[PDB]
Ligand binder design. Structure first.
Ligand SMILES: *[C@@H]1O[C@H](CO[C@@H]2O[C@@H](C)[C@@H](O)[C@@H](O)[C@@H]2O)[C@@H](O)[C@H](O)[C@H]1NC(C)=O
Ligand code: NAG
Ligand code: NAG
Length: 275
């Protein structure tokens, strides 16, 4: 019962920030393969990578060496300077009349729907937007409190790839409104980039990192398993263990929500039914 929705947002701009847009495009491919529909996936990506004069492969974005083109077919709801706090927060709330610029696609969800939000690109108490102002912890949590008050969702999972990512939720995110959050790092740690030049077996055409460590770890995990048999809690434990040497994967909010299979939010790719 209900519909799966998602909001994917890369909070940065500039070719050196290739990884944030590659991470978000990779998440789109997982949702598309799982049967989540484009009308229910709101994408915020600056869109300055695929056709950049510096990109050695125009029209292509990869999130791993030798990987597939993750840019192919990704919707463009909010690009360029339309990625900002006003539009990101109105999209989460689901109020089309509060969007200023962009497609107007928002989470106009119903009570049995599921929501998955993934943000990639931070400092204590804030995460980036392509231009100032940045998004502050209190303002993001206040929007989540407004969304909970409307009652227009069954449960929500929010994944954040950023430095000090846990600072967006620590001591603020409510625990009884069906919102579970997972962060690449805790409130006082930075997060790591990965797939950078100068590593064994790396495409010689690139001078930028292709992904972020926590992101490619959870994204590649989604690609390799039947999401009906892996829960959010099992992914938390697996990814937390895998990257313990770099940062402390952290969880906040309504922890029992993580008993849900990942397919509740992402669907599942029939090619991995045996895995
Ligand atoms: C949906 O949003 C409407 C527009 O909000 C107004 O415009 C935005 C851009 C901001 O300036 C905001 O402060 C304004 O209030 C509201 O008129 C409307 O009541 C909202 N609907 C619901 C159900 O919340
Ligand atoms: C390409 O990347 C450069 C470096 O960040 C940026 O200044 C420029 O705006 C981008 N151009 C396009 C066409 O996306
Ligand atoms: C964050 O993780 C580090 C370990 O890398 C730990 O020393 C620190 O106490 C943690 N901070 C919080 C607020 O939990």
């Amino acid at each position: 019962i209900g519909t799966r929705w998602a909001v994917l947002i890369a909070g940065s701009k500039g070719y050196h920030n290739y990884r944030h847009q590659a991470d978000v495009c990779h998440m789109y491919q997982i949702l598309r393969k799982g049967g989540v529909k484009d009308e229910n996936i709101i994408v915020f990506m600056y869109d300055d990578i695929a056709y950049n004069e510096s990109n050695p492969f125009p029209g292509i974005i990869i999130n791993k060496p030798g990987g597939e083109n993750v840019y192919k077919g990704v919707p463009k709801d909010y690009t360029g300077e339309d990625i900002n706090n006003v539009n990101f927060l109105a999209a989460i709330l689901g109020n089309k009349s509060a969007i200023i610029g962009g497609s107007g696609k928002v989470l106009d969800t119903s009570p049995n729907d599921h929501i998955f939000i993934y943000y990639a690109x931070g400092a204590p108490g804030k995460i980036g937007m392509p231009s100032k102002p940045y998004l502050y912890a209190d303002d993001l949590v206040d929007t989540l409190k407004q969304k909970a008050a409307t009652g227009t969702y069954k449960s929500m999972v929010f994944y954040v790839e950023a430095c000090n990512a846990g600072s967006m939720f620590e001591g603020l995110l409510p625990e009884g409104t069906n919102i579970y959050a997972m962060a690449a790092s805790n409130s006082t740690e930075g997060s790591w980039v990965t797939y950078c030049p100068g590593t064994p077996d790396f495409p010689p055409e690139f001078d930028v990192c292709l992904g972020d460590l926590w992101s490619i770890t959870f994204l590649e995990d989604c690609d390799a398993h039947n999401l009906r048999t892996e829960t959010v809690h099992q992914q938390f434990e697996l990814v937390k263990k895998k990257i313990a040497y770099a940062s402390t994967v952290s969880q906040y909010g309504d922890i029992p929500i993580s008993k849900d299979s990942l397919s509740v939010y992402m669907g599942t790719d029939p090619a991995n039914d045996n895995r």
